[PDB]
Design a protein around this nucleic acid. Sequence first.
DNA 1: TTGAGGCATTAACATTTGTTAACGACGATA
DNA 2: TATCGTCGTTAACAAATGTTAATGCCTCAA
Lengths: 236, 236
Amino acid sequence: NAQAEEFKKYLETNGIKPKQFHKKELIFNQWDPQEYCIFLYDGITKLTSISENGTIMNLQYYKGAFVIMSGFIDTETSVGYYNLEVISEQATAYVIKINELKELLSKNLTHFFYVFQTLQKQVSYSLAKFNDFSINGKLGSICGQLLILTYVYGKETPDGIKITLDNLTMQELGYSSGIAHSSAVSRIISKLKQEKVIVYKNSCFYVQNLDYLKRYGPKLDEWFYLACPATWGKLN
Amino acid sequence: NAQAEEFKKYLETNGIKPKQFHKKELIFNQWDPQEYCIFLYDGITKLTSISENGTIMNLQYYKGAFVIMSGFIDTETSVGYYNLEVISEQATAYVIKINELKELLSKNLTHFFYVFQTLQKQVSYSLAKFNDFSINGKLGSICGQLLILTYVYGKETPDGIKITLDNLTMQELGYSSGIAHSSAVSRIISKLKQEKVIVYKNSCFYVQNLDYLKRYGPKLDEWFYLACPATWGKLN
DNA sequence: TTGAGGCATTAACATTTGTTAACGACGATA
DNA sequence: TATCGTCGTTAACAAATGTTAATGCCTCAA
């Protein structure tokens, strides 16, 4: 929040300008692997990859402020071939060429730390997410992904906790959890309404049994407490 | 590695000696979170997590030299609760308090980017591993882990590529793939043997059909090609 | 008004994986 | 030499997930 607004100013001071993006457009993609260092400031995006046979996989979401690097800071090679798609109405981000980056952090080390610590928030997130998705199969993958969605995009209402996301199609959750067919997601979600943990009203998902998800995403809930405690407190 | 050898003699110059560890020993653990920065220099270690009901989860391995961290750098708080177990006969690492690390890298930048580099290796590795494990279920998870081990512990031989690892039980593969019962991994393996993909020799695993594994782990193969290209060329 | 396309839902059927038990091989110990 | 404990197989049955198809609800567009 503040540590990011500080880094915001450091960029405008050295000539980096904010570029604006709209929904369904990607800052970088897997087919034009050019190494940048994106600093999303305001908006929602998802990192994705498309298999050789056209299978989509949503790896995670990013809501500003956050850092996303498509290349290494030493060798300037690609960290991997991925796409960062804008899913919110409009998003703003400070793009940087990895060339200009190493020279930019060598001056101020408190912003070096800022970027370094977010990279740590990335690793802990990946291990936590990987941990819970592997133990309980797909049923837990859904609950794990849901758990993440209620912390980052959740507000409390009398009918539960509303996930304030414009689009949550069944195939979109399946892509986040690794399920290929929407009928399989629906079957699982048909059980979560049955067991009375979630309900679908007002074109949104409302969670009524947060603990049920914590049981299938314990390492993930642990991650919010340690990495995003403010987000954690809003539901605890 | 040259970058690591420069780092080794940078810490010894500041009074940081190397502790010795033996197999089965935990450098840190999920129950006594001391926020360290481990510069594992020689040896093999697995990062593990245990649930409240006692389910082991092998998240990944670490071949020295590398960098593991149990705490952030600014907040200096934990990044999650994991155990770093030594699995070789002996391993040599430099334990340093997380606060100590802050000032050393503040002086030397070439060593700072090296630490930043290794974390970029971590992120890309986690997403690639998550990508290939979440698409093709367990069969793709088992086939994915084998692809990782062959690129790190694999040596060419006439029979096939031996995976040099002592005590690689059916359990350790399951732990590393989310499978909780040895009968389930043996069944998957009973097929990969029937399909002329691997062999059991001298209580070891020889891989004969590398391309098969590459079908179920393209992002991981991609990662070794972009992140650890030296170790990649050995099998191409 | 009709009709097209997309998303949610369910069915059914096939395949995988979860789960337990029983068997046999290998080691180790007395 | 017999006996126990670990680990790899396979079997058998339950549960979960892959997969396809059909149906119904909703928007959109003419």
